[PDB]
Design a protein around this ligand. Structure first.
Ligand code: SF4
Ligand code: SF4
Ligand code: SF4
Ligand code: SF4
Ligand code: SF4
Ligand code: SF4
Ligand code: SF4
Ligand code: FES
Lengths: 626, 585, 135, 150
């Protein structure tokens, strides 16, 4: 829409973009530090200088909007720009330590890369490696560490904490050369900070370090892949960094990172270790490993001859493709199908009768937000990064206080006005499920509000779509097991442990003829199983999830992955005609055993050593803002 | 050394109007032609434009293109000192043969078929060059792994003999690439020459001769040779493919292992080429250190050719003297580079270290004696005239064979052609140093022996000039261009400041920031023109590094010389062509 | 220490490691004081010195030379190429000669110095001197 | 003095460079033991990284400790590129060359070995100057008395 010139090269640029943006899009590398596409412009690092021929002056390109016929020059054709790059990089290196041999950022460092390409190439300002100091304060944290001398004070962290996450946990300690980043409240691990790791990722250097990753490897020795995070229903796309077992690094997941969209929470940033914890990667019968073909025969016999006495407990942490294949097999076996979400979510959606599920992008269109139930920031954290309008609240409010929500009553909803988005969490309605659903159903028809159900488990909404009308009540299935109406159980994941304690399954192992547990872990519920079948985690399957970021499909790249979908499809080759189903219902009221927490929301994050430390510190805290 | 002149470009465009496209790069000038016009353009460039001297030809693999293989040709105009490069796409995996235009190009076509799978219609029994008859792959293809396809378990027999079944080293891979059989070797031998005479002489694959690894085939009538062929590959390790997987600075030690007899020369050719691609200036002190050490290697390399050449006819007394002098050159190189044979002295941007204390005193002690000892070898050899007559009339190479076969080094100079890149295409410091180019008149085995002899004398005069220049420089003068981002600074710099450390990390982790483009540069190695054709798509690793061996083309003329002659002259002929199994990649 | 028990090896020069082999035989190091006769015909030799890298194309030919030697024989792999494949983990290089012929002594280096090759021979002699001394 | 022999690991003896002393506060080391901080520069610079095997951990006190460092000399070029890449003054090439042995296993250096090699090399030739050759008597057989100068 607008034509410009960068080193006498004509380039078309859409009006509204900056010279730096246009240059990067066209492969013209301009060194930069403080500009981040997701944050507000700062103009502080000054590394993006370009020579604007039209005004004969050095100007920062990150703040320069494109204008028809403008002519700029970069370091490619301007010595002035080259001299300032050498000076700016030398200035940053003045008190920067000789820490590259042990710094976690080596190989992916903006200062190290830019300093080697555009830097002075030699030391002009002679500072001994032993005098590389800058004012500094311990962040008092077990997960984050700040190295102020490595800091190139760029304010990306401060901007991200204030503009993206909104926790306002950092501040710049005393001005001038020694400006250093400090947590607003220490110890940091129990402050307003949500340990999302965004500050680690936006930092262009190794100033903010992830302690769990410190010294274990080198950035260039890891493999990288991107997929869908399934630890909650948001659907963020994250990058897993792993090793293979060769000379470079161990066969495990070493850390995880968000993309430049900064869509990530602590579960996604520090929960990577749940992928390495006691994995079940082979089919087993008892304690002995068995060939998948033999296990497929056992299951084929169970469902073919005893399907009408078999119950299937789905997991909301399963991708669409597996859910569908298992459900199709169930309908070919005349089995019982259920899911723990039948206790609360399904009852709510049955009464609401019709809901809205817009993408995060569509949140811009809302005028106000109404949070009903739990602390949204603790259930679908990243959503709290996009609810920037007025927020009303009915229910528990702990980390959501960062949004300064206004408490209201159900009677007040009748008076709100204009494109209201109601975000409701059915797992937190305790006995008022039908009443609340009925009230929101009226509101959706009379006033036209958007009623968006926020499940706490990744694919629960899809489970509901595929199980509505045919699902059995979880307590009815368990009651049917005690009565002897159900002799075999195929349980997927540990979603069920949110309603029944372990002992129940220790006894079920004796009562049932066949207890089949499909899990990713060798510990937990699978310890009580007769037949153990592996269940895939993120990065180990190509499964799609119905999330807040749309219908996202993951990527399979972790090499130790067990082919979950291939196994079930193979079993399904033995089931062609649809036979039917059995449904059990019951009015018994099952109470949730534990409330989800920001650092522990499901059986997967529970197996994360990192999040468990964060959870133990903050489990008792209920007030973070006042 | 300029490229295509503006005049010949237009005469080529006026003749191939919509079929050729002139183009320029930072370092090369040439043409892109349509497949059906490749040969007419080459015949035009050679016969009607004087690009008679054949330099090299090879292929580049572009899997993302429909044709997938671009033929690359490089010719030279000795009358004007110009180079041309011609590119063309292969039509259905084929290309036109050029061996009738340049006989020396026959072996280049064999190498290409073995590495890429390109067939040359009309190659006159095209067979694989290095691999055996029946190999199922084309290693230079981008989808072929560098380690091949491991298929057989090949444990260490020494470890099995002691019951130790566990791997002996953390990097020991039990699965290995499949191994051929003695029968497999027999098919490549028989599929090489079609029976023409009585007996099939077989001097290889392994023979007790001087160049034991070089395999020869003679078709004899009693004692006369009618037909003759050579089979290489007894040392093929995948050099060109190893470069595709390494950073530029990492390949320097592999250049030492090409012509292991003159490693510093190999490094100079390679480094001088990479420094052109990256645009790296070399400080003065390093330029003289390169020029001096490159010449000490030429003396050291000619001594080996003379010692092994003398060993071929008894007279072991010359072998001892030649190696007595080689031990002196190695004492200087080892003391400065740190290794006797595989020096690994040059670095991108200069030299590894400065000269070691007292190194100039040792060279001066060498430059004063060596002139007297050269007079010993002249008369100690000519003393026995039983062999002097065995060389003054055989193996004559006409100037037509020099350009048709792409000969270089002493092989070309012995025949009258003063083709010396140290003067025609200067590098390190050969422009600021004065020396002479020895040239012969008959062009026989004797002329090549005499050519190499004065080259040692001329090299002593070059070293003498480098010594006085080095003494006049302060020991403060640089031997490394530390101001360029692609030059790894010495450890002493990194131990001191962050400004140097970040450079070391950048280059070591990501490689040098090479720009896109192509470059062809060659060094006057003791055995000929050692060329390096590097193709860069941008990044720390080259997309293709073709190595043009001057010795390889010097051997391609062997079947022409021994034909119609007696087999007794084969030992003297091969020796006068100074070939090295290592330069056959 | 000094034994009149002579050794008759055949030097198989394949690459750079062969050049250092010639320097050891020359007047600078005297490998004769150790009883090494150095016969050139493999029919009458008992020690196979593989000095250089072994290409897969040469492997069948090399194995033949070995089986063609009298049974009281030993083998020395000079340099890493003949020892473990050296610096060439490629499609055409045989990763160590001990994969087709048992070797008794491995001489590291790229290439080993003439003294390293001599020390390597003493090691072979050390082995033999006490190979006929136990049983 | 410039010979590129068997590799070694210089030890913590007080003569460390500024770069290492600058990061000492982060390391778990012992006096007279290897200086290595496991930066992987040697192996990354090496054209044959498979011959190396380096491992380091993060101790519960937050410091870094090198736990494994092995090199297989039979696949080494003895090129010196790794020593160039060492930023802490740890990796070095000694004068040790008498390493011929009877098994591929005897040609694998562990950390304990790299330390012993360097300690011995520094003990015998640490203060020796950088000369073209260290002894003139051993060279006199071939060269004779050389007229040196300042
Ligand atoms: S922040 Fe970058 S330049 Fe500084 S020590 Fe770390 S890797 Fe090196
Ligand atoms: S990690 Fe996230 S929540 Fe914690 S301080 Fe940094 S930006 Fe704020
Ligand atoms: S800690 Fe990192 S992101 Fe924050 S100001 Fe310093 S360099 Fe920038
Ligand atoms: S908000 Fe949910 S999907 Fe996003 S990173 Fe956190 S746990 Fe994963
Ligand atoms: S060990 Fe080294 S010197 Fe010997 S042949 Fe192999 S690469 Fe060449
Ligand atoms: S380069 Fe030096 S400090 Fe780094 S891993 Fe190697 S020996 Fe250790
Ligand atoms: S000397 Fe060269 S080949 Fe050997 S470990 Fe060091 S860098 Fe690698
Ligand atoms: S990027 Fe423009 S000022 Fe920092």
């Amino acid at each position: 829409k607008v034509k410009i010139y960068i080193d006498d090269v004509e380039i078309e640029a859409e009006k509204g973009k900056t010279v730096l943006q246009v240059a990067l899009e066209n492969g013209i590398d301009i060194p930069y530090f403080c500009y981040h596409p997701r944050l507000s412009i700062a103009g502080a690092c000054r590394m993006c200088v370009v020579y604007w021929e039209d005004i004969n002056r050095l100007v920062i390109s990150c703040n320069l909007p494109v204008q028809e016929g403008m002519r700029v020059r970069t370091h490619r054709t301007s010595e002035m720009v080259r001299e300032q790059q050498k000076y700016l990089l030398q200035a940053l290196m003045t008190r920067h330590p000789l820490d590259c041999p042990i710094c976690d950022k080596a190989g992916e460092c903006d200062l190290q890369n830019l300093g080697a390409i555009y830097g002075p190439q030699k030391q002009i300002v002679p500072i001994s490696a032993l005098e590389k100091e800058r004012e500094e304060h311990d962040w008092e944290s077990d997960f984050l560490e700040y190295y102020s001398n490595r800091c190139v004070v760029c304010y990306r962290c401060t901007r991200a904490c204030d503009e993206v996450v909104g926790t306002r946990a950092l501040y710049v300690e005393d001005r001038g050369f020694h400006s250093n980043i400090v947590p607003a409240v220490r110890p940091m691990d129990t402050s307003t900070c949500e340990m999302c790791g965004i500050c680690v990722h936006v930092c262009p250097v190794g100033a903010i370090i992830s302690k769990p990753f410190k010294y274990w490897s080198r950035s260039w020795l890891l493999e990288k892949g991107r997929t869908v995070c399934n630890l909650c229903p948001v659907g963020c796309e994250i990058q897993i960094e792993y090793g293979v077992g060769d000379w470079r690094s161990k066969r495990k997941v070493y850390r995880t990172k968000p993309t430049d969209e900064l869509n990530i929470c602590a579960k996604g940033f520090f929960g990577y270790d749940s992928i390495n914890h006691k994995r079940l990667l082979k089919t087993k019968v008892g304690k002995r490993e068995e060939t998948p073909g033999n296990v497929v025969n056992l299951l084929t016999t169970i469902l073919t001859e005893h399907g009408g006495k078999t119950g299937i407990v789905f997991s909301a942490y399963l991708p669409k493709e597996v859910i569908d294949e298992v459900l199709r097999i169930a309908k070919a076996s005349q089995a019982y199908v259920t899911a723990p979400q039948s206790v609360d979510l399904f009852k709510f959606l049955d009464e609401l009768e019709e809901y809205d599920f817009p993408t995060v992008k569509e949140f811009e269109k809302a005028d106000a937000f109404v949070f009903i139930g739990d602390d949204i920031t603790s259930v679908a954290t990243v959503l709290s990064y996009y609810t920037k309008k007025k927020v009303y609240k009915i229910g528990k409010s702990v980390r959501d206080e960062k949004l300064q929500p206004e408490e209201i009553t159900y009677e007040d909803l009748q008076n709100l006005e204009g494109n209201v988005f109601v975000l409701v969490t059915p797992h937190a309605l305790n006995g008022e499920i039908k009443e609340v659903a009925t009230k929101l159903k009226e509101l959706k028809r009379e006033k036209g509000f958007k009623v968006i159900p926020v499940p706490k488990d990744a694919n629960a909404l899809y489970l509901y779509e595929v199980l509505k009308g045919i699902y059995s009540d979880l307590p009815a299935v368990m009651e049917a097991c005690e009565r002897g109406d159900i002799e075999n159980l195929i349980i997927f994941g540990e979603d069920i442990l949110e309603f029944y304690e372990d002992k129940v399954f220790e006894e079920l192992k004796e009562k049932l003829e066949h207890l089949v547990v499909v899990s990713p872990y060798e510990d937990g519920l699978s310890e009580y199983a007769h037949i153990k079948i592996p269940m895939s985690l993120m990065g180990e399957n190509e499964g799609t999830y119905k999330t807040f970021f749309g219908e996202v499909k993951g990527k399979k790249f972790l090499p130790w992955a067990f082919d979950d979908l291939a196994f079930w499809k193979y079993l399904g080759e033995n089931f062609k005609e649809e036979k039917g189903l059995k449904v059990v219902k019951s009015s018994s009221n099952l109470r949730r055993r534990f409330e989800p927490h920001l650092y522990r929301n499901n059986w997967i994050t529970q197996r994360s050593q990192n999040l468990s430390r964060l959870y133990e510190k903050n489990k008792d805290i209920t007030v973070y803002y006042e | 050394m300029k490229w295509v002149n503006k005049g010949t470009v237009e005469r080529v465009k006026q003749e191939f109007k919509d079929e050729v496209k002139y183009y320029e790069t930072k370092h090369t000038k040439g043409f892109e032609v349509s497949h059906d016009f490749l040969k007419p353009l080459l015949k035009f460039l050679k016969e009607r434009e004087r690009f008679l001297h054949f330099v090299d030809m090879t292929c580049i693999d572009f899997p993302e293109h429909p044709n997938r293989f671009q033929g690359v040709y490089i010719l030279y105009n000795p009358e004007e000192n110009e180079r041309v490069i011609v590119k063309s796409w292969a039509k259905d995996g084929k290309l036109p043969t050029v061996e009738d235009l340049w006989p020396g190009a026959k072996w280049a076509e064999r190498e290409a078929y073995d590495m890429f799978g390109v067939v040359f219609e009309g190659h006159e029994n095209l067979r694989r060059m290095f691999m055996w008859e029946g190999y199922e792959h084309y290693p230079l293809r981008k989808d072929f792994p560098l380690q091949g396809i491991p298929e057989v378990e090949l444990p260490s027999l020494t470890e099995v003999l002691h019951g130790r079944t566990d791997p002996p080293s953390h990097d020991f891979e039990l699965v290995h690439t499949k191994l051929p059989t003695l029968e497999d070797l027999e098919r490549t031998e028989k599929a090489r020459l079609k029976k023409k005479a009585e007996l099939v002489l077989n001097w290889g694959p392994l023979h007790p001769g001087t160049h034991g690894t070089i395999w020869f085939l003679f078709d004899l009538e009693g004692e006369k040779v009618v037909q003759s062929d050579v089979i290489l590959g007894q040392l093929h390790r995948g050099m060109e493919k190893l470069a595709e997987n390494l950073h530029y600075f990492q390949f320097i030690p592999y250049t030492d292992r090409m012509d292991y007899i003159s490693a510093i020369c190999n490094e100079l050719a390679y480094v001088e080429t990479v420094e052109r691609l990256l645009g790296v200036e070399v400080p003065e002190k390093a330029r003289y250190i390169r020029t001096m050490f490159a010449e000490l290697q030429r003396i050291n390399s000619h001594l080996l050719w003379l010692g092994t050449g003398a060993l071929d006819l008894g007279a072991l007394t010359v072998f001892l003297y030649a190696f007595r002098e080689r031990e002196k050159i190695m004492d200087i190189i080892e003391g400065n580079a740190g290794y006797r044979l595989t020096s690994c002295f040059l670095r991108i941007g200069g030299v590894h270290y400065d000269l070691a204390e007292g190194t100039l005193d040792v060279v001066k002690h060498f430059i004063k004696d060596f002139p007297n000892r050269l007079k010993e070898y002249h008369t100690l050899l000519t003393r026995n005239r039983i062999w002097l007559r065995r060389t003054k009339d055989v193996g004559v190479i006409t100037r037509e064979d020099v350009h048709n076969y792409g000969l270089s080094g002493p092989v070309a100079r012995g025949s009258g052609v003063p083709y010396d890149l140290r003067k025609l295409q200067p590098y390190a410091a050969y422009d600021e140093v004065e020396f002479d180019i020895p040239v012969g008149e008959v062009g026989d085995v004797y002329d090549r022996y005499l050519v190499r002899m004065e080259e040692m004398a001329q090299s002593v005069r070059i070293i003498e000039q480098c010594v006085q220049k080095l003494e006049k420089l302060p020991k403060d003068a640089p031997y490394l261009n530390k101001e360029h981002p692609a030059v790894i600074p010495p450890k002493e710099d990194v131990f001191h400041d962050l400004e140097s450390m970040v450079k070391s990390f950048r280059v070591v982790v990501h490689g040098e920031d090479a720009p896109p483009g192509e470059v062809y540069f060659a060094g006057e190695n003791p055995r000929g023109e050692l060329g390096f054709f590097i193709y860069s798509k941008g990044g720390g690793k080259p997309y293709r590094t073709r190595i043009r061996s001057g010795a390889l083309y010097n051997l391609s003329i062997f079947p022409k010389l021994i034909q119609g002659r007696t087999i007794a002259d084969a030992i003297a002929l091969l020796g006068s062509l100074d070939p090295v199994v290592g330069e056959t990649d | 220490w000094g034994r009149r028990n002579s050794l008759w090896p055949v030097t198989i020069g394949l690459a750079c490691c062969a050049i250092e082999m010639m320097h050891t035989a020359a007047s600078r190091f005297d490998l004769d004081r150790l009883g090494v006769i150095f016969r050139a015909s493999p029919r009458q030799a008992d020690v196979l010195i593989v000095a250089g890298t072994v290409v897969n194309k040469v492997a069948p030919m090399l194995k033949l030379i070995w089986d063609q030697m009298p049974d009281p024989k030993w083998c020395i792999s000079m340099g890493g190429c003949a020892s473990a494949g050296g610096p060439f983990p490629t499609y055409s290089t045989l990763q160590g000669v001990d994969r087709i012929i048992p070797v008794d002594v491995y001489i590291p280096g790229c290439p080993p110095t003439p003294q390293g090759l001599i020390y390597g021979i003493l090691q072979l002699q050390r082995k033999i001197k006490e190979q006929g001394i136990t049983k | 003095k410039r010979f590129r022999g068997a590799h070694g690991h210089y030890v913590w003896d007080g003569t460390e460079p500024d770069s290492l002393k600058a990061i000492e506060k982060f390391m778990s080391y012992e006096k007279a033991k290897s200086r290595c901080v496991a930066c992987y520069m040697c192996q990354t610079a090496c054209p044959m990284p498979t011959l190396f095997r380096i491992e380091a951990v993060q101790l519960p006190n937050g410091k870094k400790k090198v736990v494994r460092f092995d090199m297989n000399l039979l696949n080494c070029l003895f090129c010196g590129l790794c020593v160039d890449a060492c930023p802490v003054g740890c990796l070095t090439m000694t004068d040790i060359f008498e390493l011929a042995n009877y098994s591929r296993r005897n040609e694998v250096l562990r950390m304990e070995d790299l330390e012993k090699f360097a300690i011995d090399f520094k003990q015998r030739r640490g203060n020796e100057p950088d000369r073209i050759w260290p002894n003139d008597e051993e060279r006199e057989k071939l060269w004779g008395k050389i007229e040196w100068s300042g």
